[model samples]
Target: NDPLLHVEVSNEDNSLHFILYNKTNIIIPGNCTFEFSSQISEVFSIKMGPHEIGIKGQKELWFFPSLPTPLSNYTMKVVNQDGETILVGKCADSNEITLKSPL
Candidate 1:
């Protein structure tokens, strides 16, 4: 059995939604965080600028950048809907590829 992390990346309306799911009996005991990184978001925004200003439909094309880049880093944070980050992480890397390909 694998403790799977479910990820949902979608372009709904204008804002993009990225999600992760720990699909197991194990309780994560914290908030689930995901990143739309500069590499990914910027490719979408097409400007490589900070200040995550993606609001859906600002432009036409969408970003589906291949793996590997500082932009691919998506920090899956543990937080609540109020927008407060709880149980902060200690890892220095962003994004994970657990079971996407046979290992």
Candidate 2:
């Protein structure tokens, strides 16, 4: 299993939540940033954690950025224990999702 993130979206398309799961064995680094958006909307950044599970964005909000399309878009970066940055694998849904890791 590699670094993968599971995404959850509401039925009303009003809110979305991201669950970052580091299935790798590198002790994944944190403070990682993500760029999420829809083809119909602009882009925004959210930060992940220094732990196994990284969470961001709001499950409920009243704005555009806080609310993604029915199918959301997101991007993530993965860093290793060492001071190195690399790309391992990427994922997405009906929208666009990107990922970076120390491959």
Candidate 3:
């Protein structure tokens, strides 16, 4: 089965959040890469447990200090330990995401 990646801006500190979920019935060890059009990027390690019946899917969270200023295009790619691409998500423009006020 395919995995899922959820991206959003943090309301607490305006950080960038990446949530990788495992939809299969087996464990997944992988890493997620964040790429920006400006040539800036980051990679985070993740390990997710299997999604079981009557239990929520396993997921991991990665946080970046904050999104780059002057919003730009960005892409999130998830690859398993075996070098298999699990999922990829892209943002054509930062304006597409609304930033929430810090509490």
Candidate 4:
């Protein structure tokens, strides 16, 4: 079975809140690196335990697109976790997704 995960983004006062929900039974690594196709001035890192869902921000995720660029313009990658960091087989802008599976 596939490990389920979803990313819900909401606009905060001055930043963005990333609600990363892991729907599967797998517990994500303590330290996960978010690699993006777009170039961010600074690097951001986040970690969370299983079923620890909530609100709030980034090290300034501030994923800024270059000239004439678009959203979802990058392929996200994970270093600590083994699975897709992005959504698959869902709506174009859907944040709900599957990350990994049990072995």
- Highest lDDT model number: 2
**C-alpha TM-scores of all predictions:** 0.34, 0.46, 0.41, 0.45
lDDT (Cα, tens digit) per residue for candidate 2, span 1-103: 4444333344343545544444444544555545444565565545444454324322111234345444433433333444234443244454333344543
lDDT of 4 by residue, 1-103 (tens): 2444555544354554444554545444434445434354333434433233322221223332221122243343344544334333221244332334223
- Model 2 residue runs over 4 Å out of place are 1-13, 50-89, 92-103
As a whole number from 0 to 100, the lDDT of residue 93 in candidate 4 is 41
Against the true structure, candidate 3 reaches a TM-score of 0.41
Q: State the displacement of the C-alpha of residue 45, model 3, in Å, after optimal TM-score superposition.
A: 6.3
Ranking by TM-score: 2, 4, 3, 1
Candidate 1 minimal-lDDT segment of 10 residues:
52-61
Of the candidates shown, which would achieve the greatest TM-score relative to the real structure?
2
Q: Where does candidate 3 stray beyond 4 Å?
A: 1-7, 11-14, 23-55, 69-72, 92-103
Query: RMSD for each model, in Å, please?
Result: 11.8, 6.2, 8.9, 6.7
TM value for model 4 = 0.45
What is the Cα-based lDDT of residue 103 in candidate 2?
A: 39
* Model 1 C-alpha lDDT per residue in residues 1-103, reported as the tens digit of each score: 3533443445454554333444434444432333333533332222222222122211122345332332233443333333444323222344332213212
Tell how far residue 7 is off in model 3, in angstroms.
4.3
lDDT of 3 by residue, 40-101 (tens): 54544444333321123334344455445433454444454444554554543543332111
